[PDB]
């Protein structure tokens, strides 16, 4: 679990969105595993606008933050699940690091702010759904 609170927006993994998220929907994209819903309170998270490939992510399964090198956002294949059929997930970035079912939603940060959230993982790898291209989160 985990979300990004920026302005009147809440960003979450689409496969973990609640009824309130769907009732206050702004935008959703299955191929990215992203859903953005509206909030009445102002969120205090800064989004990064960069091409950083180093950052720090929160791993709830270890209650620890880890530094990682990560790849450029791309279409990476993702196996079937109770949430999605087998497909290519776009805007996905991989890093060598621990993650397990329950870690989705952990924020990845660089020196410029929020880069994205944990969305995939397995075999010593962890995938992050990038949010840096979503320029409307600040306007
Ligand atoms: C940190 S998530 C994780 C980690 N280690 C093993 N498995 C997982 C689960 C995992 O990869 N997915 C299940 C939920 C939907 C994900 C998707 N973005 O399509 C795929
Ligand atoms: Zn950065």
Curated annotation (Swiss-Prot):
Catalytic activity: Selective cleavage of Tyr-|-Gly bond in the picornavirus polyprotein
Residues annotated as catalytic: 15 (for protease 2a activity), 33 (for protease 2a activity), 104 (for protease 2a activity)
Binding residues annotated for Zn(2+) 1, in chain numbering: 50, 52, 110, 112
Source superkingdom: Viruses
Summary of the function given for this chain in its UniProt record: Cysteine protease that cleaves viral polyprotein and specific host proteins. It is responsible for the autocatalytic cleavage between the P1 and P2 regions, which is the first cleavage occurring in the polyprotein. Also cleaves the host translation initiation factor EIF4G1, in order to shut down the capped cellular mRNA translation. Inhibits the host nucleus-cytoplasm protein and RNA trafficking by cleaving host members of the nuclear pores. Counteracts stress granule formation probably by antagonizing its assembly or promoting its dissassembly.
Assembly notes: Homodimer.
Name the UniProt record assigns to this protein: Protease 2A
Organism: Coxsackievirus A16 (strain G-10)
Lineage: Viruses, Riboviria, Orthornavirae, Pisuviricota, Pisoniviricetes
Range within the parent protein: 869 to 1007 of 2193
